[PDB]
């Protein structure tokens, strides 16, 4: 709700990635609805995911990604995490800042 996402798209998207090692971020952002929202909402989701308010999505926070969507969601695998961080962290600091995050969703 935090990023104006609908219950039904979140339900459907978790359905597909229910299973270990099956998460694909790009497919998820599309299905959950995030790829078609405004930049502003893309930013509020960003700041939701950054649980510690550091201004960056640290790797440990990227691992509990799904949990922001649903409390009973699984943590991502290290393989899933690495893959996500590979795509998102273009400045090579090992963290995802707001601008990288936003940019990665623009696909």
Place of tokens 């696909």: 107
H/E run at residue 42? helix 39-49
Counting contacts by CB under 5 A, is residue 80 touching Mn ion?
Answer: no
**Is 52 assigned to a binding site?**
yes
Burial of 105 by CB count in 10 Å (0-12 exposed, 13-18 middle, 19+ buried)? buried
Backbone torsions φ then ψ of 72, nearest 5 degrees: -95, 10
Counting contacts by CB under 5 A, is residue 99 touching Mn ion?
Answer: no
Rounded to whole angstroms, how far apart are CA atoms 4 and 9? Answer: 11
Least distance between Mn ion and beta carbon 77 (Å) = 19
In terms of CB distance, is 21 or 52 closer to Mn ion?
Answer: 52
Counting contacts by CB under 5 A, is residue 104 touching Mn ion?
Answer: no
**Is 61 assigned to a binding site?**
yes
**Is 93 assigned to a binding site?**
yes
Ranges within 23-52 binding Mn ion (CB under 5 A): 50, 52
Contact partners, residue 36, CB within 8 Å, separation at least 6: none
Total of residues contacting Mn ion (CB under 5 A): 9
Which of 58, 59, 77, 102: binder of Mn ion (CB under 5 A)? 58
Residue list, annotated binding site: 50, 52, 54, 56, 58, 61, 89, 91, 93, 95, 100
């Amino acid at each position: 709700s935090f990023a104006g996402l609908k219950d039904a798209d979140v339900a459907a998207a978790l359905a597909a990635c229910s299973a270990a090692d099956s998460f694909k971020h790009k497919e998820f952002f599309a299905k959950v609805g995030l790829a078609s929202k405004s930049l502003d909402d893309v930013k509020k989701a960003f700041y939701v995911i950054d649980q510690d308010k550091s201004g960056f999505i640290e790797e440990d926070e990227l691992k509990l990604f799904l949990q922001n969507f649903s409390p009973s969601a699984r943590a991502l695998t290290d393989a899933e995490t690495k893959a996500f961080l590979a795509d998102g962290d273009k400045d090579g600091d090992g963290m995802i800042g707001v601008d990288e995050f936003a940019a990665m969703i623009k696909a």
